[PDB]
Amino acid sequence: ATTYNAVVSKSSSDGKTFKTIADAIASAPAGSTPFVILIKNGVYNERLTITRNNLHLKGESRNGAVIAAATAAGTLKSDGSKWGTAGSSTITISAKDFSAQSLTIRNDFDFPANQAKSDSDSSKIKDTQAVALYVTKSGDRAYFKDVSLVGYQATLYVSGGRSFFSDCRISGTVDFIFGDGTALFNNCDLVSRYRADVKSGNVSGYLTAPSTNINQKYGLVITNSRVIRESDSVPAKSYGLGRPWHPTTTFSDGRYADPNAIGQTVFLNTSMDNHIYGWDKMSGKDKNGNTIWFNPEDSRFFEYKSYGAGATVSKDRRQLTDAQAAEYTQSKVLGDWTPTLP
Template identity: 50%
Template sequence: MRYLIFSTLALFFHSVSAAPDFQAVVDSSGGEASYRTIGAALAAAPAASEKPYVIYIRNGHYREKLTVNRSNIALIGESQKSTLITYGAFAGQKMPGSDETWGTFHSATLTVLAPDFSAGNLTIENSFDFLANDALDRDHPRKIGGTQAVALALDGGSDRVAFRNVRISGFQDTLYANTGRSYFVDSIIEGNVDFIFDAGTALFENSDIVNRRRAGGRMPSGYITAPSTNIDSPYGFVFLRCQLRREDGVPAQSVPLGRPWHPTTDFDDGRYADPDAIGASVFIDTYMDDHISREGWTSMRGTARDGTKSMVFTPESARFFEYLSRGPGAAVNAARRQLSTEEAMHYARDKVLRGWIPPFADP
């Protein structure tokens, strides 16, 4: 049954321009659409559905902050470049009508909390102007803190979520993948500081991972991944046949592939860096432009038991590996650990996703 559902969604995705079968239409300009906002269409979706509830979104700029808390929702846009979902919340910003701030994990433009979600042919963007703030001196009166601004958050009951031909855009903390399994194919994920992060299992296939510039030529100019994968999970972030690219203005040798994040966590004996967050990031058969640092990876500080940021977690303490990297940013040295051919075979799609077959995944 699940295979038939996936096949139906795959057929829908590839034939979307030819009067696709959908359950709701969103059109910001009105017309004959059922809904003028995506939020209204989501609110009208069934609480539970045995097959994908497809919401077709016509081209437009949808300034909405959305949460998906119902299973089997599919958001399919008319085109990736012209179907734009955007919001500008950031961690240090006060929530409307409150003295409390969003915080990193609630700043997302789109938050998925339910299983079997899928999306295609659209852009999800956090529009917070990170660069304008980044350009200000540290003591400037308009300088703000808490610049983490998530575009897409996968949390709560999120699992078996799939994206094809999507653009996920932000700067710091663009993609928060905390729980479950997620799959990204033929897509673009762009940001600068730790822009793919947290504890979930995410597979990226044939996608562009784009580093965006910092203001003032800061070094390092960013970090691609900051995984906090639990030690009991064999897979964190896996990149298969991807392309690591950069915007103009991102210097050569300025971006590590990742750093190990040990989130500050409450335990019975105190609050400190989670020792079981043994981050995992693996790049296989991936093109790397010259912005990737020769060392490949870097360290990250964590909270000690005394509350200071005095703990240092090195790349060697994490599960950071490569196999068949190529391009001007590729290198083989003692700092960039390589998988053997036999080890790389354990990172095939079916193994990483533990048997889940994503909708619209190629054979």
């Protein structure tokens, strides 16, 4: 039994439908009863913030139901201030028990076009983060099944609670899955994109930039997935599996890189093409304003039974034992939450 509380459609000749997803979401009664919205095929140029618990979106098809907007961190608002990374997101989830199924979410900020702009071009943005999907500290138990997430830098921002991504596609370049949330990915294609602006022997990007607090058991966990290059033009050894993001954070003694954000990224039973070279370092500013480097060997970066040409084994790429791998089951990672669709 599957019934819809609202339907979004591009066609008025279709039936009794909403024209925009934002309108359908808004039409939901106040409260926490399940509200399920069907979204028919089409490109919906919308930015959405979800604040109602137990809201559920279902696209007609992942290929054809698209939610898209173009916003970079460096994009200016009306008052002349920047949107920022969090603010750049096409979809923001700030509610509990959200699900999205069979749809694509894009940030259409044209990173390559931006980089190709002349250095003197005042429209050339430096803050090139452009988030497709953002799960905030308020968005626990967020479930994404058969969803495609599209971006370049900072595609997926997972913060706070638990999120589960299943049968998914996620594309990007730099730090394209990042944040301090517990995010489990199963049977996903993680797509590393070509960068025309990167010189022959330099790094193109990093799949993950976890900022997981050291006292939090699970950060980014990728299982039974495929780490793939967008094209044959993506060079060998051009992408890192992760680098440690220690976010600039306001403390009592100032604003600087959080020392206790010692991120976790764990890959289990995942294929990797040879664009992968391993893990990498990342810099921030310390309490004195000096550059500080955070190293992968000091971070919680692990693999278990990786395969494919990018799956090399050395000292610099720590491996889980069988016993340790057993700690990364869905049951263990998500605790008492079993992700279910309406």
